[PDB]
């Protein structure tokens, strides 16, 4: 476990709910790329890495192996489903708050299991869909996950934002508030 | 809350002393429980849970898989690391330092890569040992970080407080001072 | 090109 640099080639995921699947490659924690099983194309989260090529066909077949393997383990474990853990939610800015200058709001949702979540940005009872982006479910040492949701905005005196997190490991939805102060 | 059955495959690679120490560990998980794993140091699939045992016995039965998995240290870990040496291991982002105040004094070190950093608090050329509280290293996701180091103090006229920050991208530490 | 590692089937 003790090392200078660690990488996952790759982070394979498949779940009964949906059914959903995810294929990623991570280095030192951060995500290098994700393969879209729908459109059958590789999408890099870093521009310096775009230079290389990764054929999507591998992720497509590997996820089909995990489809059989998950179906095999349900019969073996006499139907034992995942335990819904408590997701930790925290909302903070990327850079120091400047009313004029632009900024990126970050809603970090940690300790996610199973990887099924609904992250929503709220501003004055209205939902925000413009200027939003989400990272894929990122792996953890405790075999749980963490997801990051971004929001590009220009701070204002009357503008206030909130992050609604919906999970099966919550009795009520979690909401974290933010103000430019 | 409906029933969810989750299966994960984490074909991980570990690295130390550059290219001198490489350890391949590929593990299969169900649900949040690691059932079976393959360490490069052992050279065979070894079950962690009773659920891992029927797969491990079957995969160790086939000699062809053993040779391909033993090759994965060079075929996966050692090969992909050479690509990292030119891209991710070349990425360097200089941090931005801002002190916000008073009884409390916080040093907001934002946007930097790699994760290695050493931030210190000084009270008039003298390093403060106690009364320092630091938040854990915050991963921003977009290959950038941030660390919030707070320092409790007492106010006096003519006393300057400095935030000393060390990072590989920086050739010399940043001299950001706050006058009182 | 980045070379990955595959998962084997369960019996």
């Amino acid at each position: 476990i003790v090392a200078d640099h660690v990488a996952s080639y790759g982070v394979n995921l498949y779940q009964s709910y949906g059914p959903s699947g995810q294929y990623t490659h991570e280095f030192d924690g951060d995500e290098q790329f994700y393969v879209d099983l729908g459109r059958k194309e590789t999408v890099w989260c870093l521009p310096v890495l775009r230079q290389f090529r990764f054929d999507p066909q591998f992720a497509l077949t590997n996820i089909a192996v995990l489809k059989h393997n998950l179906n095999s383990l349900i019969k073996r474990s006499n139907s034992t489903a995942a335990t819904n853990e408590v997701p930790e939610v925290t909302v903070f800015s990327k850079s120091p708050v400047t009313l004029g200058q632009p900024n990126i709001l970050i809603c970090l949702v940690d300790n996610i299991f199973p990887p099924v979540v609904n992250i929503t940005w709220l501003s004055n009872g209205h939902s925000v869909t413009e200027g939003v982006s989400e990272t894929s479910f990122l792996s953890k040492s405790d075999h749980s996950f963490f997801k990051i949701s971004y929001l590009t905005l220009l701070p204002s005196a009357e503008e206030s934002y909130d992050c609604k997190v919906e999970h099966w490991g919550l009795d009520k939805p979690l909401l974290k508030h933010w103000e430019p102060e | 809350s409906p029933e969810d059955f989750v299966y994960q495959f984490k074909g991980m690679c570990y690295f130390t002393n550059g290219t001198e120490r490489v350890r391949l560990v590929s593990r299969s998980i169900y649900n949040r429980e690691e059932i079976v794993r393959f360490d490069s140091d052992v050279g065979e699939f070894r079950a962690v849970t009773l659920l891992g045992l029927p797969a491990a016995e079957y995969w160790n039965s086939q000699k062809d898989i053993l040779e391909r998995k033993r090759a994965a240290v060079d075929r996966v870990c050692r090969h992909n690391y050479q690509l990292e040496l030119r891209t991710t291991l070349q990425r360097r982002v200089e941090p931005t330092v801002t002190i916000s105040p008073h009884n409390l004094l916080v040093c907001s070190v934002t946007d930097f890569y790699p994760a290695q950093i050493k931030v210190r608090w000084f009270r008039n050329d003298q390093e403060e040992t106690a009364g320092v509280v630091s938040t854990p290293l915050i991963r921003n996701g977009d290959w950038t970080f941030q660390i919030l180091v707070m320092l409790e103090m007492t106010p006096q006229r003519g006393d300057v407080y400095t935030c000393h920050v060390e990072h590989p991208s920086l050739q010399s530490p940043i001299t950001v001072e706050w006058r009182a | 090109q980045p070379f990955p590692q595959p998962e084997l089937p369960y019996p």
Partner: T-cell receptor
Amino acid sequence: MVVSQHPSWVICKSGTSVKIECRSLDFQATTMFWYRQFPKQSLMLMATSNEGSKATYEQGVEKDKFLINHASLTLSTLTVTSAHPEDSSFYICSAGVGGQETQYFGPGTRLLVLE
Amino acid sequence: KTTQPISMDSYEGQEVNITCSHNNIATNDYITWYQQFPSQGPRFIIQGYKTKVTNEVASLFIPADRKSSTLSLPRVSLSDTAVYYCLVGDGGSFSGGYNKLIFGAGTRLAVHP
């Protein structure tokens, strides 16, 4: 790892469609392939398939004539629509765990098309 | 892709060593061998990467430069009369990579009493 192929021997008229079945017997075929060998020549890959879909045919050979239905983790059948004396060849299928490196070949089907 | 002998004729209980020539081999490539009997599907004998492999059927030898490889059969029996195919590649897109396994001419071996 053992792979079977039915029928073993086949003889038909020109226009008749032939269903060559590829089955995995002591494992579950992740990837199933198809190969074509002529009188005194080497093996040539026709296509690659995965459950449920879909075929990844190679080159210079149409998919109108050759139909592959890899549904099931052990079954994959090849259909030769409107048979022609040119098609008279030896057909072998592969199965892996998966990929071409892990492949295990079937016994083979000898096709003979006549006027 | 690869070049191996056209044909070999040996006596019973003799060590047969077929040499495969692959100078243009890529770093992440496998050396795979198939035994085809007339007229049936080929049999997977041995496979390797950089190190020496040992099977109940045969043994694979790979030197440091990887420019060539040699398949050694212990005591050839009358039943070992077959076509031995040598193949280089990572298994193609489904494994995944550029180097897809393509069947060469193969060495026609014949064993005699």
